[PDB]
Design a protein around this ligand. Sequence first.
Ligand SMILES: Nc1ncnc2c1ncn2[C@@H]1O[C@H](COP(=O)(O)CP(=O)(O)OP(=O)(O)O)[C@@H](O)[C@H]1O
Ligand SMILES: Cc1cccc(C(=O)CSc2nc3c(=O)[nH]c(N)nc3[nH]2)c1
Ligand SMILES: [Ca+2]
Ligand SMILES: [Ca+2]
Ligand SMILES: [Ca+2]
Length: 159
Amino acid sequence: MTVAYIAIGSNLASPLEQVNAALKALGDIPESHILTVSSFYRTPPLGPQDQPDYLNAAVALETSLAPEELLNHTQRIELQQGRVRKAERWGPRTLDLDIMLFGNEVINTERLTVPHYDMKNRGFMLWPLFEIAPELVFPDGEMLRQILHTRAFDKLNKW
Ligand SMILES: Nc1ncnc2c1ncn2[C@@H]1O[C@H](COP(=O)(O)CP(=O)(O)OP(=O)(O)O)[C@@H](O)[C@H]1O
Ligand SMILES: Cc1cccc(C(=O)CSc2nc3c(=O)[nH]c(N)nc3[nH]2)c1
Ligand SMILES: [Ca+2]
Ligand SMILES: [Ca+2]
Ligand SMILES: [Ca+2]
């Protein structure tokens, strides 16, 4: 088994309902078990700002799935929760499930890049992650606690 860490975001169609439904669906992923769910946070949008605030959270998911098999399931859940692709980059969505980390693995395939390429620059990913895994060390040896101690991130407010 490996512990994967998944970032959850939603800013459309009742984010609380979307995130709760996503947590139920994550539990139903085969060869996998949810270990920990963070608090829910209400966060101002990064990137384009002409959209509603996000509900952000993080989940620790123990799994024996291959990394791309996990991706298959997370994409399926997003699509089943009505995620529609629009042309605007970083536009609003009913559900976003980003695989932040897959154990200590470094993955670079056509469909999957892990660690998430920008997570070390996003408070809305790092703070919920720290809540559920304060001892976390990245594949490159960097400590999550040290990033959050050193770098300026705004405090997150709970939903
Ligand atoms: N770690 C990861 N988690 C989820 N999807 C990933 C991923 N690495 C690559 N992908 C790929 O990313 C593709 C596009 O996903 P999108 O959700 O449209 C990007 P986004 O989440 O809006 O922006 P971001 O990646 O800057 O957070 C997916 O179809 C998937 O194949
Ligand atoms: C550091 C940086 C620069 C430019 C863009 C971004 C995004 O996160 C774009 S997509 C996105 N996803 C979320 C999200 O899940 N929550 C919040 N608050 N904002 C988000 N924005 C991050
Ligand atoms: Ca399961
Ligand atoms: Ca994302
Ligand atoms: Ca995504």
